Amino acid sequence: ATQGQVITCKAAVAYEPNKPLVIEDVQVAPPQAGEVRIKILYTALCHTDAYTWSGKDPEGLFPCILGHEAAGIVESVGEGVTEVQAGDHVIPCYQAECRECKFCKSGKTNLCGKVRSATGVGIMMNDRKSRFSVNGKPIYHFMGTSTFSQYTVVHDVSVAKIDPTAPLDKVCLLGCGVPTGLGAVWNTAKVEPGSNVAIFGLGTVGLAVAEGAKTAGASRIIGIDIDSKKYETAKKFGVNEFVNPKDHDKPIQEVIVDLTDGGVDYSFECIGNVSVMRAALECCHKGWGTSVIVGVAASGQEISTRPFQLVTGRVWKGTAFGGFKSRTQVPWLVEKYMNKEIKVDEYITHNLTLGEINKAFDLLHEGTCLRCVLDTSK
Amino acid sequence: ATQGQVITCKAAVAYEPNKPLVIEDVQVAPPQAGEVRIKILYTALCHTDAYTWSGKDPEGLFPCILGHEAAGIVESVGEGVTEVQAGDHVIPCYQAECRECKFCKSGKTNLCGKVRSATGVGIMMNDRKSRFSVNGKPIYHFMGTSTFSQYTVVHDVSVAKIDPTAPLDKVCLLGCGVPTGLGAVWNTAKVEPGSNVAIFGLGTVGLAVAEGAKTAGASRIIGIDIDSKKYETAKKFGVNEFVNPKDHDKPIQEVIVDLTDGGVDYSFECIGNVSVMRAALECCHKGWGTSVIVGVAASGQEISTRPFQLVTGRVWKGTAFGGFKSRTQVPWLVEKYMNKEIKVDEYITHNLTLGEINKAFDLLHEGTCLRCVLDTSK
Ligand SMILES: NC(=O)c1ccc[n+]([C@@H]2O[C@H](COP(=O)([O-])OP(=O)(O)OC[C@H]3O[C@@H](n4cnc5c(N)ncnc54)[C@H](O)[C@@H]3O)[C@@H](O)[C@H]2O)c1
Ligand SMILES: NC(=O)c1ccc[n+]([C@@H]2O[C@H](COP(=O)([O-])OP(=O)(O)OC[C@H]3O[C@@H](n4cnc5c(N)ncnc54)[C@H](O)[C@@H]3O)[C@@H](O)[C@H]2O)c1
Ligand SMILES: [Zn+2]
Ligand SMILES: [Zn+2]
Ligand SMILES: [Zn+2]
Ligand SMILES: [Zn+2]
């Protein structure tokens, strides 16, 4: 009977970079003002988690509970919370939507800064402390989500309330990769019917770009990956031509320009590699081509190109969560999934349990793997 | 009457890089199919001319008649030419508008390909020879215009027909820097009323961006220049705040972010320096800020930034001629000038003659000089 009480539950704790997560019992404090305590039923993992786990993220902060892609059920809410209540089905999101800041009220972006000063340093806004502990010492939150746990506490501005019949072992992916890819196409680029598109990197994000392009009515949807086995899988997501840059001595941008008689209308970089980001811009058609950076580069890395590439009409842009407003639009994407208008299930290549989370980290180095989903009950 | 005849007239010839131009009598042959022979009355000089003159082009062609900003009076036309005729007042343009090629049919007439195989190597399409010679030896065309001459011959798709009452010693500017600046605002960026703008470089182009932005209804129009005495004339064009980067220890981008509590809505680089291009991007506001590189720089260098600047909502663009279609829209700009809706006179700080053209090249380093206009009659 949990309202207002500390909850003791299982969670995967990362104590040190690049070592195995240990599954412990942890204490989850109750939600203060503006906060929501969530029973997490299913959580996926992705490169973003492993980046921090690996020690490579200069923002990383150990020990922490990682995880940002999940779906669950609200256990309780703190004072003032009105948009969700106990028993609501929810997707916690790493990107907030407070609806009250200069960014939210602007109408020109989805990038809300309301809680980022707490969440970027693994704590809560209300008291600037953590809600997680083991043996009475604090464990940092991660991305404002911390979903590698049976229970988490998040800010109310980061909770999307969803269709209560949607399957929670599928819609956990609607918190990260899938909306990023779809939205890079529909919101950031605004791809028109008949456009030709190049997609660099055919993982989950690239594949969501491909589905978003197919749905928007693109013609040629050219996939580029250094692993040729990715093409067969990518076909069902709408990729219809494939190039492996290893199969050519010329730089990949030149190859794509020759293949398309001038370059593509839109390109999307879905890797996080600055050299490939430059190639993606340079394979765009002059006059009107646009390149959207979706990949997240490591610290200190820079993109470059020649000014003439922009002067002759190419446009360079990028996307954060596909340009979607998380609380307002994640529930819309869940609706679309329930109506069979967007794919989600096809991206889930493995199902494990939270107990087996280190095995899921190994699975990240398998080229076949797109998303792993974890059942947190074991 | 000179129609059908070779004309002999004064021109300034560049025999090789870096030497003084030679004010010679040259022979200008009559126009062939699709060509127009123009009596040039006034011509200005800009950096683009100096770039080739100084040898700073991989391989310019010498000897040549430089010059691309001019106005005059058609002397005769070749076979097939219908849009202009003898006695028409005209502005020859380095940007063609053929209306018939793949680029023109999409709208991007600034990529028109009709005559560039000839103009790019200093000759005419009809016979792949030049129309200029001295003592029987060929002198190459430049930028398809060659305006440092009493008479020139250009392709009809490069000729704008203008209001015959407009002053030729003023509208000679409306073929290059002024449209590029105005058009960077109105066409490339599409600046909205109330926008905050930063403009890097307050020469002719930056002043044209300022006026564009003023006319478009911008609020803060912040000019940045290393020469503080550029601000005085800038205020007449609409600049209403000024920063000299030399007055600050922090890089300029940070100073502009601090001045505007986050960044401007639009920035414009009007210099051609890749490190200022980066600063112009990095001083744009998170979420929506857009930076335009204004004009072909010919720097031969790379622009760089961290891809986070684009992931978090900044957009990078550029423009060659402000998005304007030369033949259709240069005459519209002349009408706007005639109706006092844009300035042209205030750019002209110096008046010399074609005889004195080498003194005009000296002025290109003069802080005080914006455009110098040359009267070709002596
Ligand atoms: N902008 C955002 O909001 C946002 C949100 C989520 C994820 N991401 C980013 O998107 C990226 C993709 O994540 P994912 O889960 O699909 O990753 P993933 O690892 O499943 O896929 C990466 C793909 O890129 C391919 N690849 C690697 N190097 C390559 C190269 N040089 N040329 C061509 N292909 C290459 C791999 O073979 C793999 O198929 C990551 O950078 C991640 O940070 C961004
Ligand atoms: N295609 C070419 O060959 C070529 C070469 C160079 C420049 N250009 C074009 O020249 C155009 C500008 O022409 P203009 O006639 O206005 O030039 P201009 O020389 O009259 O003006 C340039 C202004 O920038 C200022 N400036 C220089 N360095 C600076 C810095 N680091 N920070 C801030 N201010 C600085 C100078 O003081 C000057 O006022 C640009 O559009 C550029 O694209 C073309
Ligand atoms: Zn993720
Ligand atoms: Zn907000
Ligand atoms: Zn010029
Ligand atoms: Zn054309």
**CATH number for position B300:** 3.40.50.720
First to last CA, chain A: 21
B232-262 burial, b at 16+ Cβ within 10 Å, e below that, comes to: ebbeebbbebbbbbeeeeeebbebbbebbeb
Tokens of A218: 């693109």
- A109–B288 CB contact, under 8 Å: yes
CA B155 – CA B278 distance, rounded (Å): 37
Minimal CA–CA distance to B5: which of B31, B25, B23, B24? B31
Rounded to an integer, what distance in angstroms lies between the CA atom of residue A10 and that of residue A137? 16
Q: Say if CB A239 and CB A202 are below 8 A apart.
A: yes
Q: Which residues of B touch A111 (CB under 8 A)?
A: 286-287, 312-313
Q: Do residues A7 and A139 share a domain?
A: yes
Are residues B13 and B147 part of one domain? Answer: yes
Helix%, strand%, coil% for chain A, nearest 5: 30, 25, 45
Task: Assess contact for A149 and A113: CB atoms under 8 A.
Answer: no
**Which residue segment(s) compose the domain that A249 sits in?**
181-319
Write the single-letter amino acid at A29: A
Interface of A to B at Cβ within 8 Å reads 102-103, 106, 108-109, 111, 274, 277, 286-288, 293, 295-297, 300-308, 310-313, 315-320
Method: X-ray
Cα of A101 to ligand 4 centre, how many Å?
A: 4
Task: Give the whole-angstrom CA distance, residue A62 versus residue A52.
Answer: 10
Query: What are the two backbone dihedrals, phi and then psi, of residue B164, each rounded to the nearest 5 degrees?
Result: -70, -10
> Do A370 and A349 form a contact (C-beta atoms < 8 A)?
yes
Rounded to whole angstroms, the Cα distance separating A65 from A38 reads 14
Q: Kindly state whether residues A228 and A175 are assigned to the same domain.
A: no
Type and span of the H or E element at A338: helix A326-338
Of the candidates B301, B253, B252, which has an alpha carbon nearest to the alpha carbon of residue B274? B301
What is residue A172's DSSP assignment? G
The kind and range of the H/E element at A27 are: strand A22-28
- Split into its structural domains, chain B has a count of 2
Identity of the residue numbered B158? S
CA distance B169 to B73: 12
Determine the Cα–Cα distance for residues B287 and B311; give it in Å rounded to an integer. 9
Cα B54 to chain centroid, rounded: 18
Pairing of strands B241-243, B221-224: parallel
Pair A118, A206 in one domain = no
For A264-300, give one letter per residue: b (16+ CB within 10 A) or e: bbbbbbbbbbbebbbbbbbbbbbbbbbbbbbbbbeee
Q: Is B152 helix (H, G, I), strand (E, B) or coil?
A: strand
Atom in ligand 2 nearest the alpha carbon of residue B56: 3
Q: Are A98 and A112 in contact (CB under 8 A)?
A: yes
Asked whether residue A172 falls in the same domain as residue A196, the answer is no
Ligand minimally distant from the alpha carbon of residue B104: 6
Of B305, B286, B311, whose CA–CA distance to A320 is shortest?
B311
**Best mutation target, B308, B309, B312, to test chain A (most A CBs within 10 A):** B308
Three-state DSSP class for residue A216:
helix
- Angle A368-A370-A371 (CA atoms, 0-180°, nearest 5)? 135
Tokens of A42: 């299913």
DSSP codes of every residue in A97-118: --SSSHHHHHSS-----SSHHH
Q: Could you tell me if the CB of B283 is within 6 A of ligand 2?
A: no
Amino acid at B360: A
Helix or strand run (H / E) with residue A281: helix A274-282
The answer to whether B324 touches B175, Cβ cutoff 8 Å, is no
Neighbours of A369 (CB within 10 A): 16
Given A319, A341, A357, the domain boundary residue is A319
Helix ranges restricted to H, chain B: 47-53, 102-106, 116-119, 168-171, 177-183, 204-215, 231-237, 252-259, 274-282, 308-311, 326-338, 357-363
Cβ contacts of B312 on chain A, cutoff 8 Å? 111, 318, 320
**CA distances for A362 relative to A42, A201, A355, A359, B242, angstroms:** 19, 20, 14, 5, 56
The angle formed by the CA atoms of residues B175, B181 and B182, to the nearest 5 degrees, is: 90
State both tokens at B338.
């005639």
CB contact under 8 A, A310 and B317: yes
**A243 vs A260: CA distance, rounded Å:** 12
| Residue B230, ligand 2, Cβ within 6 A | yes
What is the three-class DSSP state of B104? Answer: helix
Tell me whether the omega of the peptide bond preceding residue B63 falls within 30 degrees of 0, making it cis.
Answer: yes
Judgement on whether residues B165 and B205 belong to the same structural domain of the protein = no
User: Taking CB atoms and an 8 Å cutoff, what residues of chain A touch B316?
Assistant: 310, 315-317
From A103, A313, A320, residue closest to B108, measured CB to CB: A313
Task: Please indicate, yes or no, whether residues B104 and B250 belong to a single structural domain of this protein.
Answer: no
The two three-digit tokens of residue A155, written as one number:
């800010």
Q: Are residues A159 and A44 in the same domain?
A: yes
DSSP element (H, E) containing A351: strand A348-353
Q: Which two tokens stand for residue A306?
A: 């020649």
Return the beta strands (E) in chain B as ranges: 7-13, 22-28, 35-44, 69-77, 89-92, 132-134, 137-139, 151-155, 159-161, 197-200, 221-224, 241-243, 266-269, 290-294, 303-305, 315-319, 348-353, 371-375
The span from the CA of B188 to the CA of B295, in Å, is: 11
Nearest-CA residue for atom 19 of ligand 1: A203
Catalytic residue among B93, B371, B372, B376: B371
Decide if A176 contacts A68 (C-beta within 8 A). Answer: yes
SS3 content of chain B, % helix, strand, coil (to 5): 30, 25, 45
Q: Are residues A292 and A235 in the same domain?
A: yes
Of A68, A58, A45, nearest in space to A17 by CA: A58
Joined together, the tokens standing for residue B5 give 């005849």
Atom number in ligand 1 closest to CA A272 = 41
**Pocket probe mutation, ligand 2, options B45, B46, B47, B178, max atoms within 8 Å of Cβ:** B47
The string over A24-39, giving b where at least 16 C-beta atoms fall within 10 Å of a residue's C-beta and e elsewhere, is bebbbbbbbebbbbbb
- Measured between its terminal Cα atoms, the distance across chain B in Å is 21
Last residue of a domain, one of A279, A302, A319: A319
Cα–Cα distance between A264 and A222 in angstroms, integer? 9
- The interaxial angle of helices B274-282 and B252-259, nearest 10 deg, is 30
A33 shares its domain with A65:
yes
Nearest to A124 by CA among A13, A8, A28, A60: A28
Decide if B144 contacts B119 (C-beta within 8 A).
yes
Is A144 in contact with A155 (CB distance < 8 Å)?
yes
B5 and B153 part of one domain:
yes
Does B369 participate in catalysis according to the annotation?
no
Cis peptide before B20 (omega within 30 of 0): no
Give helix then strand counts, H and E, for chain A. 12, 18
Q: Do B320 and A311 touch (CB under 8 A)?
A: yes
Q: Compute CA distances B135 → B16, B28, B378, whole Å.
A: 17, 12, 21
What is d(CA B244, CA A211) in angstroms, rounded to the nearest whole number? 49
Residue B352's alpha-carbon distances to B91, B123, B362, in angstroms, are 20, 29, 12
For residue B3, what is the enclosing H or E element? Answer: none
The answer to whether A13 and A64 are in contact (CB under 8 A) is yes
Unique residue bearing structure tokens 């494939």: A242
Beta strands in A30-167 (DSSP E): 35-45, 69-77, 89-92, 132-134, 137-139, 151-155, 159-161
Last residue in a domain, options A319, A338, A357: A319
Axis crossing angle, helix A252-259 with helix A274-282, rounded to the nearest 10: 30
Q: ∠ at Cα A157 (A153, A160), nearest 5°?
A: 85
3 state SS of B377: coil
* Distance, CA of A184 to CA of A324 (rounded, Å): 9
Q: Is A288 left (phi over 0), alpha (psi -120 to 50) or beta?
A: alpha
Distance CA A296, CA A59 (A): 14
Other C-beta atoms within 10 Å of A190: how many?
Answer: 12
Phi-psi region of B211 (alpha: psi -120 to 50; beta: other; left: phi over 0): alpha
CATH number of the domain encompassing residue A342 = 3.90.180.10
Is residue A214 domain-shared with residue A279, that is, in the same domain? yes
Q: How far apart, in whole angstroms, are the C-alpha atoms of residue A148 and residue A13?
A: 8
